[PDB]
């Protein structure tokens, strides 16, 4: 079947024909995009996959990059669903392609997805990132690649030749240059590349916009629940180094009282079993905390010429179309992972003292005064001990601090600089959600919908959820083709207005039709984005 | 008429028979309570009036103490009504008495009123402090004295024998000891003395509670729109001195490059025409500001053993009944006096920059960071330039900072220490009010009502206002006799609950019946009373 047989710039491939509810889909899973970054390649910028003979099989999902695996709640769908579903391996630089069966007629727009997992975990192989529905139904050419997370992706000794950092991003950039020079053959338009990701994938998409060289490889961008500018998606060189060598040292690299040879250091590191590194991953953070990750993009003054803050602050984004948004309760999920009093198993009605402590875990960089400021802001002084309030407060400190305000800081900075921005607030809690009611709509629970999982009848969502999904898919693909999530020409009732400095408009993405709103946590985010920082830089 | 003829501990007096709408009233205006504090007596603690021969005439209002007179809006009722209505003079230590005609049967409870005017102005002679209605109607024995304001009342060189400070308070204490030993003769009960005042009079009442010796002279207390503990009702010794000598120096005291003789300094000051002092009164403040006064009670470690803060913080008020309250917009009035953009003549829709400046005038002690904090708190980040919002914000910064939060800090501190406290929010704007609508219910516009001015038909309020007034008078006199503003035994519908740490209950004093509420600006006041201070003590 020529539908499943495609010649790529480096060789032939054989896809597989998948069956989505509305029909058939072509799927080319496992395409090498680079030479496995193993052995003496570990910590190195990726290299273009060499051309192969014969017909490369591409009927299946490849190995997940090497990464920590979540224990915490073993056998629990809520956590497991995020875990690797393929074998772990340093040989994981592959991407996927879904195209409607049969290949489109003309150059369809492409949706390149970037998975997220703190920069330390994640995989395109995942169920919720099943690009079949968006290709099947909205007739889109969808691509999802794997990029090195953890030490392998980001361990860096800034200035070094052999562990220079951000290589997990270069992985994604490489997948992008491949989509450029080969998506054509799948019926995709190399001229309408729309990047889109969640958590650190969103953060990533952000970095592509902030990085010159990534510019020519995409035209539109979506950033769900995450940005390049907050407190957790980048570290300085100094800290990077501090965590590289510290990690090395715990692994015996270098052995003895040796030193001053970054090369020997990396050479040594390059011999340790992958799992040895993952084993010490979490011991290099400088404080007890949540929503903070050990190995993530570093401000090298290369891939990022300066901090994302400085960049979105003075960049020229005068033409960029960008969709951005957030969910009802970003912070909830993270509380179970480390804030005394919280669990998925009870209502986590915490004490005040617990909440006071939470604030220091959740805002680890905060001095005392700054912590005080945060407590002032989130305490309800008519009921400073209501456990239920405290509980939700904790979730807000975390969610606002890491996701919401940073989103809003980016939305506004973008708009003010030229961007056409759109914003939203996912508020629908999936019926199927396995987390406790108290977490409401946790970080990452919009994905099922954007990808169109409710369209699968076996999966069993509600018809509303299904319709909902379709609506969501429609907005995305529409922003994808046009650069406006809006019903074509067809001005079908509710409209989605561009987020603007002055009006500050965003929409409620939920079961009830679009419902425009103004100001994304405006006060709260003024707290965080405007004042808090000066407090911190004083203390 | 023996009704109008009374023998006092120091001589005979002849009252005059006044006619209130509901009947006749005995009125003994002008009773010397002390030896005129003139000449070598200036700046000195008051002395008990010597006994006189014959029949002291007391049919009229005496001279207002020496004080600045408000220009600003000449001929304008709103300001004029506060101005002296008698001749100015250092010889002004007299008090007044109103008793129902004819003298009560049995020992009626007494309401001693303390006028307020920044500690720099004011007089019992004023129209709104007409005690005839409260005596006539509620059959109360009412007393209102004059106390030295300004330099004469408070100029102090702490530690000095001749200008030791707080003498304006000693004036009031002296009036109190007189009520003690003579109110009896007017049918008043020396056993049910209820002090009650507004602005600095409230602040004063506060100081009596905080001062041991004032204790035995009163049993209940009311504090309207003012407390002893805020930012403006007390100064330290050091500042007192700094403003005494600076004032002296501007007046040529001492002349030349002389010095180190406080006595010579005061001696010299004692020769300057009263108006020479008033002339430089306003030049000793340390910063540009509003709701800040030059000469006011000083923390000498005598009349006040320590700051009012420390005192209400550790005092034993376990038995004290205290009514406390505030008006809708305390801060409004003060804005016209010095905050660029405000006037009584336009809507004062200020700019943002104006508001930013306002904040520094209105919170003169604030460092930059602290100012930032205040701006953060009062800015509406969805509309940071809406003039109308800015406008009202300014009024709130001032009103909350100086009156409301301090009231709330006192209410709570009192309650927590044993006091039985009651609280309220006057929200009715008199129909007659001559200030612009934008000031809503300005500092001091409850007085007309408590005193019962609407009962006078000529004055022409509304019947509701009249009824309202009666209600208000009822609460006061009731708190006065019982120590509970509540309808006797007669549980007549809405009840007024004690303000409590835990429930934080207060009531809406307005046209519609009592309406209990919880938390007096709880967040906002947490800002001011809890956090702001630590910010300031850091900066």
From Swiss-Prot, chains A, B:
Glycosylation, residue list: 261, 346, 460
Keyword Membrane: yes
Enzyme Commission code(s) on record: 3.1.1.7
Tissue spec: Predominates in most expressing tissues except erythrocytes where a glycophospholipid-attached form of ACHE predominates.
Membrane topology label: Peripheral membrane protein
GO cellular component entries: basement membrane; cell surface; extracellular space; Golgi apparatus; neuromuscular junction; perinuclear region of cytoplasm; plasma membrane; side of membrane
Compartment annotation: Synapse; Secreted; Cell membrane
Alphabetical UniProt keywords: Cell membrane, Disulfide bond, Glycoprotein, GPI-anchor, Hydrolase, Lipoprotein, Membrane, Neurotransmitter degradation, Secreted, Serine esterase, Signal, Synapse
Gene Ontology BP terms: acetylcholine catabolic process; acetylcholine receptor signaling pathway; cell adhesion; osteoblast development; positive regulation of cold-induced thermogenesis; receptor internalization; regulation of receptor recycling; retina development in camera-type eye
Reactions performed catalytically: acetylcholine + H2O = choline + acetate + H(+)
Disulfide bonds: 65-92, 253-268, 405-525
Active-site residues per Swiss-Prot or TrEMBL entry: 199, 330, 443
Any one Pfam family match given in the protein's UniProt record, by short name: AChE_tetra
One MF annotation (Gene Ontology) recorded for this entry: collagen binding
Root EC class: hydrolase
SUPFAM superfamilies per record: alpha/beta-Hydrolases
InterPro entries: AB_hydrolase_fold (IPR029058), AChE-related_enzymes (IPR050654), AChE_tetra (IPR014788), CarbesteraseB (IPR002018), Carboxylesterase_B_AS (IPR019826), Carboxylesterase_B_CS (IPR019819), Cholinesterase (IPR000997)
Other notes: Synapses usually contain asymmetric molecules of cholinesterase, with a collagen-like part disulfide-bonded to the catalytic part. A different, globular type of cholinesterase occurs on the outer surfaces of cell membranes, including those of erythrocytes. This is the catalytic subunit of an asymmetric or soluble form of ACHE.
Record's subunit section: Isoform H generates GPI-anchored dimers; disulfide linked. Isoform T generates multiple structures, ranging from monomers and dimers to collagen-tailed and hydrophobic-tailed forms, in which catalytic tetramers are associated with anchoring proteins that attach them to the basal lamina or to cell membranes. In the collagen-tailed forms, isoform T subunits are associated with a specific collagen, COLQ, which triggers the formation of isoform T tetramers, from monomers and dimers. Interacts with PRIMA1.
Family classification: Belongs to the type-B carboxylesterase/lipase family.
Function text: Terminates signal transduction at the neuromuscular junction by rapid hydrolysis of the acetylcholine released into the synaptic cleft.
Name recorded for this polypeptide: Acetylcholinesterase
UniProt organism field: Mus musculus
Lineage: Eukaryota, Metazoa, Chordata, Craniata, Vertebrata
